[PDB]
């Protein structure tokens, strides 16, 4: 699974953790909502609430996020939006 | 252009305004982040900030929404997530 970061406003480290955590979600689950749940809850646990997650092969977004708490990236062909609301 | 509501926590009036507004978005724009931006900003403007909108043909989501400010719906073949964070 090729990891490609499209837009991030978060630390080099937290980004890597987003990828690691999605990688886990993609081995466990096939359904986007379930994959999405996995990442949100994991990121709520490790970096405090509140996170929102979007997983899909085809979406665009427009959200207002907290500074340093935003990432949009692809893992394989599945795109991932994870952010904290601003 | 077929409206199908999948999950909603908002009033049926504001729901209907979400559908009307998305329709206006899809008439004016073809690109998901643009469509999403039009909807989010119209809802910030009409119902006060902060809103977030996701638009696409394939995605799933797991978000923490504010009570009465959440809809997930299809419009024709596009799915639209529109919410305020909890």
Swiss-Prot record, chains A, B:
What keyword terms does UniProt attach to this protein?
Cytoplasm, Cytoskeleton, Dynein, Microtubule, Motor protein, Transport
GO terms classed as biological process: actin filament bundle assembly; chaeta development; chaeta morphogenesis; establishment of mitotic spindle orientation; imaginal disc-derived wing morphogenesis; microtubule anchoring at centrosome; oogenesis; positive regulation of neuron remodeling
Coarsely, its chief localization is cytoplasm
Q: Which GO terms describe its cellular component?
A: centriole; cytoplasm; cytoplasmic dynein complex; cytosol; dynein complex; microtubule; nucleus; protein-containing complex
SUPFAM superfamilies listed in its UniProt record? DLC (SSF54648)
Location comes to: Cytoplasm, Cytoskeleton
Top-rank taxon of the source lineage equals: Eukaryota
Tissue specificity, per the record, is:
Ubiquitous.
**What Pfam families does this protein's entry cite?**
Dynein_light (PF01221)
The protein's GO terms of the molecular function aspect are: disordered domain specific binding; dynein intermediate chain binding; dynein light intermediate chain binding; protein homodimerization activity; transcription corepressor activity
Per the record, what phenotype accompanies loss of this gene's function? Flies exhibit defects in bristle and wing development.
Record family assignment: Belongs to the dynein light chain family.
Q: Subunit details for this protein?
A: Interacts with spn-F. Forms ternary complexes with spn-F and IKKepsilon.
This molecule's function is given as: Acts as a non-catalytic accessory component of a dynein complex.
Provide the protein name. Answer: Dynein light chain 1, cytoplasmic
């Amino acid at each position: 699974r090729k990891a490609v970061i499209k837009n991030a406003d978060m630390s080099e480290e937290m980004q890597q953790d987003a990828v690691d955590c999605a990688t886990q979600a993609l081995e466990k689950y096939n359904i986007e909502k379930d994959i999405a749940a996995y990442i949100k809850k994991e990121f709520d646990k490790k970096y405090n609430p509140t996170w929102h997650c979007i997983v899909g092969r085809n979406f665009g977004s427009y959200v207002t996020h907290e500074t340093r708490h935003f990432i949009y990236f692809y893992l394989g062909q599945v795109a991932i939006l994870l952010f904290k609301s601003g």
